[PDB]
Amino acid sequence: AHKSEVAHRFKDLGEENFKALVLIAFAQYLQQCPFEDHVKLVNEVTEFAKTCVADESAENCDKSLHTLFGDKLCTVATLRETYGEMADCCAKQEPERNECFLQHKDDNPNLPRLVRPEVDVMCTAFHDNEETFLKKYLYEIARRHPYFYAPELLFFAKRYKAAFTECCQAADKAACLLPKLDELRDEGKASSAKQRLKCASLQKFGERAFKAWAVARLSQRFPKAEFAEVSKLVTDLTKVHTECCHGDLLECADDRADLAKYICENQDSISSKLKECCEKPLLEKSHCIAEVENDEMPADLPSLAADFVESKDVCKNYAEAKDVFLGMFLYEYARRHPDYSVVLLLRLAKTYETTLEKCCAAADPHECYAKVFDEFKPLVEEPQNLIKQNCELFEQLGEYKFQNALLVRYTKKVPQVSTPTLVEVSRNLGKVGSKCCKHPEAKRMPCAEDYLSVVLNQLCVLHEKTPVSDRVTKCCTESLVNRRPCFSALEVDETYVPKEFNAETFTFHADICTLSEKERQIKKQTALVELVKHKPKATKEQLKAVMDDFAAFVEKCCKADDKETCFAEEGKKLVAASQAA
Ligand SMILES: [Cl-]
Ligand SMILES: [Cl-]
Ligand SMILES: [Cl-]
Numbered sequence: 001a002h003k004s005e006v007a008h009r010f011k012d013l014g015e016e017n018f019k020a021l022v023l024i025a026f027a028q029y030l031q032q033c034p035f036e037d038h039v040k041l042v043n044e045v046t047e048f049a050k051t052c053v054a055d056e057s058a059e060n061c062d063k064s065l066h067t068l069f070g071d072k073l074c075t076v077a078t079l080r081e082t083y084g085e086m087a088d089c090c091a092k093q094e095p096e097r098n099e100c101f102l103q104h105k106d107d108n109p110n111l112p113r114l115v116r117p118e119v120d121v122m123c124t125a126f127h128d129n130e131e132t133f134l135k136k137y138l139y140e141i142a143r144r145h146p147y148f149y150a151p152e153l154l155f156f157a158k159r160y161k162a163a164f165t166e167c168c169q170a171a172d173k174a175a176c177l178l179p180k181l182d183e184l185r186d187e188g189k190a191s192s193a194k195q196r197l198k199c200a201s202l203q204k205f206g207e208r209a210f211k212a213w214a215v216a217r218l219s220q221r222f223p224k225a226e227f228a229e230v231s232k233l234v235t236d237l238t239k240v241h242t243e244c245c246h247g248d249l250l251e252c253a254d255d256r257a258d259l260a261k262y263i264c265e266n267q268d269s270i271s272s273k274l275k276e277c278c279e280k281p282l283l284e285k286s287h288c289i290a291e292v293e294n295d296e297m298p299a300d301l302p303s304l305a306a307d308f309v310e311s312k313d314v315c316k317n318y319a320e321a322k323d324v325f326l327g328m329f330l331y332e333y334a335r336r337h338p339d340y341s342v343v344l345l346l347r348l349a350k351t352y353e354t355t356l357e358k359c360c361a362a363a364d365p366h367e368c369y370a371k372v373f374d375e376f377k378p379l380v381e382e383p384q385n386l387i388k389q390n391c392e393l394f395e396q397l398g399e400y401k402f403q404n405a406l407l408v409r410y411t412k413k414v415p416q417v418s419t420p421t422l423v424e425v426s427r428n429l430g431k432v433g434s435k436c437c438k439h440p441e442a443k444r445m446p447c448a449e450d451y452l453s454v455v456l457n458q459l460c461v462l463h464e465k466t467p468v469s470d471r472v473t474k475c476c477t478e479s480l481v482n483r484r485p486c487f488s489a490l491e492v493d494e495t496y497v498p499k500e501f502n503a504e505t506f507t508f509h510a511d512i513c514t515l516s517e518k519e520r521q522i523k524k525q526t527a528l529v530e531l532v533k534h535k536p537k538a539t540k541e542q543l544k545a546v547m548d549d550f551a552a553f554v555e556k557c558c559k560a561d562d563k564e565t566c567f568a569e570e571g572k573k574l575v576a577a578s579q580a581a
Contacts, residue, residue, distance in 0.1 A: 004056035005065050009250035010049040017154055017253060019046055020138055024150045025069060025249045027142035029101045030077050030086060031109045035139050039132075041072050065250060066098045073101075102203075102247060105146040107196075107461045108420075114140060119177055123168040134161055145192035147199045149244060151253040152290075155283040156188050193428075197457045199245035205480045211238055215327055216334040216345045220446075222271045223297045223335035229269050230331055236262065260286045271295040294338045304332055308352070309372060315360040326353055339442045341449035344383055346481045348376050386488060387448050388441065394433030400521065401544075403430030407525055408543055411532040413490040416469040417459075419529045423522060425459040452484050459487075492536070499533040506530070506575050508567050513558040524550055531578075546578040 002008040010018045023042045030038075045068070052061035060068070070089075074097075080087035089100035117125070126133045137160050142148060163184065167176035201210045214234040222230065236259045243252035263270060264278035264285065273295050277288035308314060308329055318325045330349045337345060352372060359368035394402045407426035411417075429452070436448035460476035460483070467473050471493070475486035505527075512523055528547055532538065553574050557566040 002056075004052045004061040006049045006063075006068060007052035007056045007061060009065070009254055010053050012254045012257075013250060015046070018049065018250065020135075020154055020157065021150055021249045021253055022046065022069070023135060023138050024142040024148070024153055025247060026073060027139050028105065028146040028148075028150075029069075029247065030073055030083070031106055031111070031143040031146060032083060033076055033143075035136060037076050038139060039135060041076065045069070045072055064094065065248070066094045070094060070097045070101065098247060107146070107465060109144065109146075111144055119174040122177075123164065123173060126164045126168060133164075141188060145188070147196045147245065148188070148192045149195040149198075150249045151244075151256045151283070152191055152195070152287060153188075154253070155287045156184060156191075158283055160184055193454045193458055195244075196461065197454050198241050200457050200461060201480055202242060202245045207238060207242065209480055210241065211327075212330065212346055212349065213342060214238060215330050216342045216349075219331045219334035220338045220342075220345075221292065221294050223338070224272070224295055225270050227328055227331050229266075231327065233259075233263070233270075256286055257282060260289055263289055297336065297338070301336055304329075304336070305373065307332070309369060312366060314356065314369065315365050318356050318360060339445065340380070341383060341445045341453075343449055343453055343481050343484060344379065344445065347379050350481065351375050351379065382485065383445055383449050384441075387436075387444050391433065391437040391444070391448075394430075394437050399430055399434050402433050403427050404525065404528060404544070404547060405540075406430050407528060408532055408540065411529050412492045412536060413487065414469045414472050415493055415496045415533055415536060417463060417472060418466075418468070419526055419533075421459065421462045422529050423525050424462070425455060427522075427525065428455045428458065449484060456483050456487055496536060498536060499530070501534055501579060502530070503575070507571060508554060508557070510557075510563045510567055512554065512567075513563065520554070524554070542581070546581075549574055549578055 013021065019042060022045050023038060026033075026038045026041055048060070048068070051058050055061070074090035077083050077086045078090040086101075086104060089097050089104060092100055116122075134157060138153065138157055141153060141156070142150075160181075163177060163180035167173055167180065170176040198210070198213075201213060211234055214237050215230060218230050218233055218237070219225075222233075225233075236255070240252055240255045240259060243249075243255060260282075263274065267274045267278065271292070273292045274289065277285055277292055280288050311317075326349060329352055330345065333348060334340075334342075334345050340348075355369050355372045355375065359365045362368040393405060397405060403426055406429045407422065410426050410429070411422055414422075432448050432451050432455070435451060436444055439447055456475075459472065463469065463472045464476065471490055475483060475490070478486060508523065512520060515523070524547070527550055528543070531546060532543065553571065557563060557570065560566045
């Protein structure tokens with residue numbers, strides 16, 4: 001809060017990140033808008049920002065960033081002919097207009113896959129106009145990921161630039177470049193989903209659900225830190241994410257840079273793992289600190305039982321600083337439990353809270369909450385067995401067939417869900433094994449259950465766009481923290497009237513041969529979903545057999561002289577034969 005907010009953020013961030021961040025904001029709020037229209041909007045805004053830096057009294061410089069940005073966006077968005085319902089946001093004044101633009105962010109926009117050009121062509125284009133090339137990178141990611149954590153997209157952008165800078169001078173450009181880009185492509189996806197969970201927690205469940213999340217995760221990460229210090233960080237981190245999820249991207253990046261700075265100057269009070277992170281340059285520093293490994297737990301920590309169970313002033317302490325007290329409980333339990341998922345720790349906290357709510361009213365409170373910690377046992381236990389058992393299945397199957405097993409499992413749980421959503425969610429669910437099952441049973445739950453949190457939230461938000469399954473709605477609506485157990489407890493749905501057998505749904509074209517491996521698997525996993533919708537009584541054994549028939553038949557037809565008269569003819573052989581069998 002300054003006399004000219006646009007001047008203050010252009011000074012704090014510098015021209016280059018200001019520019020980049022304004023493009024991301026525009027690309028995120030108006031996803032269907034072409035690249036050159038955005039570029040032009042960003043350049044007017046930038047040229048204007050410059051006049052405020054020079055005279056913060058100049059006309060309009062005291063407007064709010066949403067007033068300035070939203071007006072600029074509306075010069076193109078107000079065209080209902082091409083933007084349809086976005087034009088409604090433009091008929092509104094702030095802060096309603098901002099709210100409208102937030103509501104219209106599209107988790108799955110109707111946007112073509114990226115035909116990646118040739119290495120020499122990308123390299124030439126990078127050398128032709130460096131700035132435009134990198135801007136296009138920012139645009140294509142921001143419009144497809146409208147909740148991508150914006151300061152962190154700057155960090156991706158920097159690594160994307162460095163990949164080209166380095167690899168376009170290699171003797172073997174492709175060998176150098178493609179691995180870097182593939183790696184960037186997949187970390188950006190993981191990052192966006194992870195950020196998507198932060199914005200959903202904030203927007204659907206409120207500042208308090210996010211603060212709980214952050215007290216737990218940060219107490220695990222920095223267990224040496226005092227409660228006042230963890231609270232301080234949680235306050236600052238909640239403001240950063242609130243800003244970013246609210247489209248206040250310049251503020252978010254600016255407050256994030258301050259957080260990193262604060263952390264790096266107070267390592268002594270925070271953690272001993274931070275030394276490397278705190279020597280990195282500005283963008284990398286923040287990324288590094290958000291993923292640093294947990295610190296060692298201080299030695300010889302007393303029991304929680306003394307302060308939270310045995311003490312004869314639990315009700316006193318609870319009934320006087322309710323949220324401070326429970327925040328202390330969760331801090332103390334999370335700092336001692338790096339091996340529990342954040343969601344489990346929050347379920348434990350919630351069970352502790354509701355016991356107090358119940359016992360502090362009771363005749364003898366002290367006697368009523370004496371056993372509260374035993375109530376934690378079955379809650380700890382359910383996520384461990386799940387993880388154990390599904391890892392076994394992963395070790396047995398491999399990533400792809402584990403994706404197939406989860407695909408059948410989730411299709412049977414919630415068969416009304418669109419097929420594209422079921423494939424994308426299940427595939428991602430399968431990636432939990434490769435990510436988490438190589439770890440010892442003690443790093444597995446935080447890794448695996450916190451990842452499932454991220455994937456189920458994707459299903460939640462892709463389904464809320466057009467709801468069709470009451471079970472998904474219920475599990476997504478009922479309580480963030482129990483989301484994973486809720487979906488895991490779904491049995492097969494017996495209301496579900498099987499989908500009528502379709503011909504064209506099970507017929508592969510010849511263009512399928514020229515797709516990537518991943519794209520071709522998706523075609524197969526699409527088909528497996530539609531088979532389960534059509535025959536939901538089919539056995540795990542009957543299904544892993546028609547998957548193999550589709551597999552071998554696509555290989556056969558793709559490796560053939562008449563690829564057209566094969567997929568037509570020797571494909572009909574695959575359909576009515578697996579229809580009967
Ligand atoms: Cl973060
Ligand atoms: Cl993927
Ligand atoms: Cl599950």
